[PDB]
């Protein structure tokens, strides 16, 4: 029972014992695997009263009991080292709100776990056995504050934490000191997304991606996730989406697809908006609103027309939901964009239309702001036309070519450049059986 | 908190304040170097300002950022610049990194100097600061008092000065070891 | 620092040991491709 609970952890420690003698890939991925199966046993009734007794005994095990806080009494230096650390890993696991509610207790514990005899020698030894999420995933909760008077001061524990993560960013020595890292960024990112202005993300950019391989595509996507949101008000759209496009593409998430990928999708949906593309939410009908899309759809629904009021109405309606996702900042722009979009379409299809007939769409809307409004539109390209008011003729271009240009062959080049994608990758993985079969 | 107040402080006058700026800045560089990363040109100009003393602060400050920028010869150079803002026994991984990061750089130089001269190390061509700190780490290696540690360095450090002395000093004939420590190397 | 000096040092051999091979290959590549012909 607690036995079997312990027995599982015995296997974990037994697999920790694998890593203990130089064997992570087993251990970590097992620990990874263990992290999931961790939900099973969970709790910590006799698992720990039997753990703190099974392993060995250490001062910190005592200070850990301050987190335990209970009564058992009863009767009943090596193996009890990183196991204890690996259990401090599970300590954090005992903190999930699994076996906890207020980790603000555990906050200090975390430090008092993190900082002492830990966050010390571990550079290549601990391999992302740090979970700074599960470090912060704790603090994540409490950042429901509100309450804290943030934090302490303002809010320095987080500033500290940032600096502490910074204190890791040093510790990210790239000795392999990586994996967990840009969660730190991601934290800081979402910390920006909490308050700060990401743009130092550019510095965070400037450092790195979570290099590289063994990082969870999840994070690597979650990397992109915020990293998308960089370009959000960085107002790069593709790349933002490309992140999403590199995030949802192969980030592995079903359980976490649920609330969390919606988020992704939300901004993702928000992307094509940035481009005014309005894909068919005909899919985004599905696994969406419910709780995510449909305002986006309403947006799309509006953005299909981009009818400012009807547009605004959605916003008018969903602003809080927007506000809930802070996609509100968006769309304030695509308003006239779609207006200008329509302006472009089923309309520019003459080599003109007039001033006033194209002004008619503005005679539908406004006048001689047209001049601006058209220049407003022409300004961006995003249409191609000309005018002369001296002509009063809003002169709407071809947009007509052939592939005479290198334009296709650009794409061919684009295709060409990709010729190495799977081709060079085949060699990227050629190794593994081929090389391990030698073993 | 946030260094725009410090980036504020940067060009704001009163080298006193700017002293304070750097100092203050320096303590919080760790987080905000990112924010700070942009003012490095001024920071460089600061370090170019002999008028303002502490600018080695800025230099070392820049060094910190440079770590956080990955810039190291930059950092080392401005770690070199500090000497004061910097200390070896100041322990940051960054320090201990630039500590290391310095150490290496010596070798090739020394090697490239060993290339030309084999007494090169007896000479000035290498930044003394480095060579110093280098040997000061050798000291620390001497204080490590397992000198194979020092040796393989000084091996590539090419300083029999180091080696022979460390030997002779440590020659007590660890009877067979002072024989073997030789042999070991 | 040290036992690396023993240890670490030895692995550029491997670095080299790696290095050689592609060479052999490219030859061998060509080798087929020239041998491939009369076939």
């Amino acid at each position: 029972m607690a036995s079997t609970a312990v027995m599982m952890d015995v296997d974990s420690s037994g697999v920790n014992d694998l890593h203990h003698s130089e064997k992570k890939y087993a251990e970590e991925d097992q620990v990874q695997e263990l992290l999931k199966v961790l939900n099973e046993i969970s709790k910590t009734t006799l698992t720990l009263d039997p753990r703190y007794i099974w392993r060995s005994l250490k001062d910190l095990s005592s200070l850990r009991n301050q987190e335990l806080l209970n009564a058992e009494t009863l009767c009943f230096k090596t193996i009890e080292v990183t196991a204890e650390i690996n259990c401090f890993m599970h300590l954090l696991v005992q903190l999930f709100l699994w076996d906890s509610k207020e980790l603000e207790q555990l906050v200090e514990f975390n430090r008092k776990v993190v900082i002492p005899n830990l966050l010390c020698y571990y550079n290549l030894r601990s391999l992302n056995l740090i979970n700074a999420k599960l470090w912060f995933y704790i603090y994540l909760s409490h950042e429901t504050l509100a309450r804290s008077s943030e934090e302490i001061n303002s809010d320095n524990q987080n500033i500290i934490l940032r600096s502490t993560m910074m204190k890791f960013l040093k510790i990210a020595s790239l000795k392999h000191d990586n994996e967990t890292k840009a969660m730190l960024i991601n934290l800081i990112l979402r910390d920006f997304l909490n308050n700060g202005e990401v743009d130092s993300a550019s510095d965070f950019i400037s450092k790195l991606e979570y290099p590289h391989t063994d990082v969870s595509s999840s994070l690597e996507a979650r990397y992109f996730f915020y990293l998308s949101k960089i370009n959000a008000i960085q107002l790069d759209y593709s790349t933002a989406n490309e992140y999403i496009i590199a995030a949802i593409r192969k980030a592995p998430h079903n359980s976490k697809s649920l609330g969390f990928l919606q988020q992704s999708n939300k901004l993702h949906c928000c992307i094509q908006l940035l481009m005014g593309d309005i894909p068919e939410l005909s899919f985004f009908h599905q696994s969406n609103m419910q709780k995510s899309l449909l305002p986006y759809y309403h947006l799309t629904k509006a953005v299909k027309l981009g009818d400012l009021k009807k547009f605004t109405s959605t916003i008018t309606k969903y602003k809080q939901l927007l506000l809930k996702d802070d996609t509100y900042q968006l769309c304030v722009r695509l308003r006239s964009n779609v207006i200008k979009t329509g302006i472009r379409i089923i309309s520019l299809t003459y080599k003109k239309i007039s001033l006033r007939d194209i002004c008619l769409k503005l005679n539908l809307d406004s006048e001689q702001t047209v001049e601006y409004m058209v220049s407003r539109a022409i300004r961006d390209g995003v249409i191609e036309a000309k005018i002369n008011h001296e002509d009063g003729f809003i002169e709407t271009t071809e947009l007509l070519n052939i592939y005479d240009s290198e334009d296709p062959q650009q794409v061919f080049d684009e295709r060409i450049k990709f010729a190495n994608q799977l081709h060079d990758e085949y060699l990227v993985s050629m190794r593994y059986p081929e090389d391990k079969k030698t073993q | 908190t946030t260094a725009a107040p410090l980036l504020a402080l940067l060009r704001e006058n009163q080298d006193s304040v700017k002293t304070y700026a750097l100092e203050s800045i320096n303590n919080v560089v760790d987080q905000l170097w990112s924010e700070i990363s942009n003012e490095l040109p001024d920071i460089e100009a600061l370090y170019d300002d002999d008028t303002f003393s502490d600018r080695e602060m800025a230099a070392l400050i820049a060094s910190k950022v440079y770590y956080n920028l990955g810039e190291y010869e930059s950092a080392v150079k401005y770690a070199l610049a500090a000497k004061d803002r910097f200390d070896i026994d100041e322990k940051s991984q960054f320090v201990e990194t630039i500590v290391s990061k310095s150490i290496e750089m010596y070798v090739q130089e020394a090697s490239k100097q060993y290339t030309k001269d084999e007494q090169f190390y007896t000479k000035d061509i290498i930044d003394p600061k480095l060579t110093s700190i280098f040997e000061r780490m050798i000291e620390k290696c001497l204080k490590a008092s397992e000198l194979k540690l020092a040796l393989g360095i000084a091996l590539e450090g090419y300083r029999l000065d180091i080696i022979e002395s460390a030997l002779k000093s440590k020659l007590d004939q660890s009877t067979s070891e002072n024989v073997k420590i030789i042999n070991y190397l | 620092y040290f036992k690396l000096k023993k240890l670490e040092k030895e692995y550029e051999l491997l670095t080299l040991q790696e290095d050689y091979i592609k060479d052999e290959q490219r030859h061998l590549k060509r080798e087929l491709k020239r041998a491939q012909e009369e076939v």
Binding site: L124, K175, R431 | - | L4, E24, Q25, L32
Partner: peptide
């Protein structure tokens, strides 16, 4: 120091495309 240390990891990591080309020489 640890400078010297993970320097291996490069070589350590290098070890491999090698062994592909090993398979390649074979494969050739």
């Amino acid at each position: 120091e640890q400078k010297i240390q993970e320097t291996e990891l490069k070589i350590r990591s290098k070890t491999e495309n090698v062994r592909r080309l090993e398979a390649q020489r074979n494969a050739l």
